[PDB]
C-alpha cells in the first residue's frame, strides 16, 4: 500500500498503518 | 513535504517512516 | 462524528477532518 | 493522552483541536 500516490485521508492512514503505537505527525503545510 | 514526496509523487516506506514519532 | 469514543482509524480519521490543512499530531504514546 | 480523552472516554472538538498543529 506504500508505494503510489497516496492524498489526503489515504495519506493519513498509510501513515497510521506505517507508524503503529509510536504515532507520526502528518504537516501537509511543512 | 510529505505531501510532495507522497501525493504528488510516488510514495516509499523510507519517506513515510520520517513522519513516525 | 467528533462526539463519540474514537480509536485506531478512526481517531486519526477526526483529527484529519478536524485539522484540515493546519494538519495534526498523533501521539498514542504520549 | 489523546487515547484517554478521545478512545477510552468520549472525544470531544475542543480536545481534537488541542493536538492540530
Known amino acids: 500500500f506504500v508505494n503510489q500516490h497516496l492524498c ?3 495519506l493519513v492512514e498509510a501513515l497510521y498503518l506505517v ?6 505527525f502528518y504537516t501537509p503545510k511543512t | 513535504g510529505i ?4 501525493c504528488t ?3 516509499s516506506l523510507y519517506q513515510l ?4 514519532n
Do not use: L
Open chain 2, 17 to 20: 517512516e520520517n513522519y513516525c
Open chain 1, 19 to 24: 507508524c503503529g503505537e509510536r504515532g507520526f
Open chain 1, 8 to 10: 489526503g485521508s489515504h
Open chain 2, 9 to 11: 509523487s510516488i510514495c
Open chain 2, 3 to 6: 505531501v510532495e514526496q507522497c
